[PDB]
Amino acid sequence: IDLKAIGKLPIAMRAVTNYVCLKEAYEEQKKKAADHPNRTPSIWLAMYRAFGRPILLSSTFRYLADLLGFAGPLCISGIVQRVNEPKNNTTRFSETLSSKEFLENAHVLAVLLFLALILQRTFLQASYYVTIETGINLRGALLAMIYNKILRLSTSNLSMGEMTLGQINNLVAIETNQLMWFLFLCPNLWAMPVQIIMGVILLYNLLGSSALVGAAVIVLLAPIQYFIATKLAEAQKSTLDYSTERLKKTNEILKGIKLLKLYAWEHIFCKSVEETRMKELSSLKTFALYTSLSIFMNAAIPIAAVLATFVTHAYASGNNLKPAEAFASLSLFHILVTPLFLLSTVVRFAVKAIISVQKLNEFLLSDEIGEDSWEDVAIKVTNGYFSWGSGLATLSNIDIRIPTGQLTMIVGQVGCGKSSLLLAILGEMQTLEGKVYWNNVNERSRSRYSVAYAAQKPWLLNATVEENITFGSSFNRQRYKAVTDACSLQPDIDLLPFGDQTEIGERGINLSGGQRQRICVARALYQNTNIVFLDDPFSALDIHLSDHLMQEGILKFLQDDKRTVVLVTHKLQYLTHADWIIAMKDGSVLREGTLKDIQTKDVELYEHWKTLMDNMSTVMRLRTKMPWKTCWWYLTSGGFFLLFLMIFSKLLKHSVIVAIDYWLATWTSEYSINDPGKADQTFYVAGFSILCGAGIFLCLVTSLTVEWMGLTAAKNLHHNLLNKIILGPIRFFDTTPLGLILNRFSADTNIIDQHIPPTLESLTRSTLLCLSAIGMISYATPVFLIALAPLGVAFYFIQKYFRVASKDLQELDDSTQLPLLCHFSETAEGLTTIRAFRHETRFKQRMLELTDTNNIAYLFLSAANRWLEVRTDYLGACIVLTASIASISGSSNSGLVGLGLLYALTITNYLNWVVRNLADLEVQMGAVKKVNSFLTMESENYEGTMDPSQVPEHWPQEGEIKIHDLCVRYENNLKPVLKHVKAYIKPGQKVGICGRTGSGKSSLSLAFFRMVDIFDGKIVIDGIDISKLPLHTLRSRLSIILQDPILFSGSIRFNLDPECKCTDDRLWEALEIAQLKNMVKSLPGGLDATVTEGGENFSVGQRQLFCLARAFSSILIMDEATASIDMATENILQKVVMTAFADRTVVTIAHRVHTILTADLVIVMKRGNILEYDTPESLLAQEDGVFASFVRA
Ligand SMILES: COc1ccc(Cl)cc1C(=O)NCCc1ccc(S(=O)(=O)NC(=O)NC2CCCCC2)cc1
């Protein structure tokens, strides 16, 4: 694969030269515009003179190539002119003459055509290859500048709080890509008239008069596509917004798989979501319509146009048209039509580039100056003003110099200024107004080169945690491991699948806010030249009974070391030696003292405080013809007249166009001067012109056919997913990550909706047209059948090479763009988190490598495409020479040679289209196959003769269930239980019972979750067989509680999705529970209130589902309250007793006394499962019952 092949030109245009050009251009812009500061409000009027890398070579070569190409058809006309044979009556001598008769000879013209074709193709490809190699550089430059102005300026930002991710939202991939594409496409806009005008002049010169009327039609046909563009863009935007709504709803739905997999809300939660898709589907249909129409515009106008000219042929009154006069005219028409689509694309591209550059100028001209205005002491200020950045009059009359090595902490939660003052001390905040002085020596950035900082708003790297803490220094096990073990991350030690080197942070493994603050303080610890600066890091993530432990680890770490260590915390848990304190209240620090010296000043301040206290052979070797069978699956299944109608229609239209050409040949076949006459002018209008309507009609039908098929398949494919995974087995869902499933649901549905149809249409059109042309060229000369056989056949092998080669390069590209954008994700996301960490300049060091490391692969892919195009062009030129030589040797008639040469010139260009479309289809279908293999697989059957049983909510025998006795080793690949634990429970057991870790999880999962070979045996449960309960409805009757009850969506506003028009959820079944009372009884949100992905965001009064409200099932099952307030848990227990009035039986799973302390009826267990029934807890102590529980009792 050779993912990182070579930089091979990092000096040329990677990082250094890009800045060396763009910065100088900016300097020239500012210096010149200084004279007219506001008379002319330009932005990048000097963006022309930005590089010195000329683009004039591109335009010059392009103009030369266009002239040669447009000349070619005149050579075709010459080669057809000499068809008439005027000999046997005059054979001039013309001895030794050179320029006299060198022109009209056929063979010399043919060789001229070959030379011109090769030269034009080569010049064109080389010129815009060079242009692209410059474009890439421009993109690198623009990015380098956006970073230079976003890194060392965007730290002290206060207006940016309106949109904190605006930069990483705009400049990520919408702007730079737009500018790179527009630079690579500019020559078309600059010199497309150089082709249109030239073609018009040639057509007027050789066509005469009957064609201009039929010629100027296409010059207006192109604006039809330019007009369709806007509507297509609007439809795409609407579809994108609907897709965003669908994606958010799907994320919410899929986030509760284990919760909904058995409750009464399994399928229903997707109902509207399904409609959502259908709803969104409607918008997609609208977009498809315009696209299909656009294809008709591109598939009909030429034919139509030429008919017009031939209609105006009746305005010429001539006998007929010389076959050497109109074949070349049609060739010119078929050549002119190419750059018009480029022009139409440029119509939108210019607007996109202008918008992007203006947005970039506005962003990079937004308070970026003044947001960075430039014994180890820094602070001596006599300011008449020290503004909170933009906010003036914030710190008036501030003057303080802080002796080092102190615990300076102005503890205060209200009006403290701890963040404003903390940022303004080290100069990182714009409080420099007035006069500021520093110490007599540093041992001009305001004396802060020895700073050290830790998070106040948490921050985690998008990489390994160990990387997140490496902090740009050495890394050896001794000091790092000692610091880590001072306050060990044991839960993080076991939870990370590869240690601290495993996934961590955003788009990685999650981390808690307490752990986040610990990580921040630890990365503060593993820093050198420690003169640390903190701004109250321990007011929220308080280490319970460990904040003192953390401060003692830090004691032996730095407070027993020679390094200034401070903290600006407000907590009184670690208040020992909290000597330094201030009373700012919108003022500077005017207080400083020892532990009791503050009481000397005797402020009401001290006293008051007390009162408030895998293999390559299985990937590469099987990569050849990768999607074939999957493509057959794609087309066949969901194709409404996929090939019954659309294939036949496409073939009919193509053959009809070929017959139209043959009819054009027939109309002017041989009657040229055999009959000037008056009745021979309109003979063939029923043989040639009468078919013209077919050319404008038949294709139009096919213009929708392919697209229509795709639309149907999309809905069906999407529906299949919902059909497949409406409900599923718990093993896979508890095994695989959620992100991959969400990606398979979203990205692949986008691909199948948007990109497959145009690729298929283009590939089919190219293949069929090339085949038709090959057939014609073989007809006109038998030798052509042999003559066109070998070389292209060899090309076939070469074709196969590309059919893989660039794909792998694309594969490299497919990953190459992942990291670099994340860089622009990180530095900006921490707009202030990386303010003054003494490594700001060092941020460029990695970016300037990444940019080149990616643009190198970009250029490699471009070069591969260029080589493919050149090879196709030369193969076509060879085919043209062969067919032309054969036609001129055979010399049957002018019509045959004209048709052959025109079709060869047509086929010259379609090979690149065919190859590119083949690659696109292969890659797209391979992407489809990733989720098309799991299209409808079913792994949870339901085949039971369970008779109709009423089974109301009544409790038969208090839910007596003892069905496990010496449980066997479980199976069915669903996290089996791998031991033996006989089960024998207490029927009338109200309160919960302590349990061992060995079987606590197994029992918790065993309350309702299915299993085959787990604990089968003698059973007495529920009055119906455990295995014979109906799979249609019985599983809907169960109930569970999540480990830490999280209901992300509303689940209250629309909680009456099943048949409950109870009209009592307001205050009768919920307020009495006293946990839902806060959100219901005394709340104005109402019976229709929702919280976005929150089970604990806005619902703190009842994190668990309201048990009484659901009983406005009958079996209640508990879990492990990981983050529940003990008082609230006791209140919920009182509500549980209120429910027990209707239940009087509850089983729970717990291993700690905090959840198993209130036992009223319990059992005496065996190794983790209940062994016998016994109320007394002391009896359980004598036996093996509660010894592990006794470890706290
Ligand atoms: C100058 O050009 C044209 C001239 C005429 C017409 Cl009517 C269309 C174009 C055109 O289409 N565009 C403008 C400029 C342009 C862009 C790409 C190509 S390319 O050779 O097809 N290369 C790729 O597309 N991708 C590679 C792979 C990695 C990404 C970047 C390069 C060729 C040219």
Ligand SMILES: Nc1ncnc2c1ncn2[C@@H]1O[C@H](COP(=O)(O)OP(=O)(O)OP(=O)(O)O)[C@@H](O)[C@H]1O
């Ligand atoms: N991003 C911001 N938006 C609005 N006001 C701000 C911002 N940053 C600072 N301020 C202002 O600066 C003043 C000083 O804030 P201070 O440092 O006391 O907050 P804090 O004590 O860190 O907050 P917390 O107690 O939650 O940690 C506040 O009155 C606040 O209005």
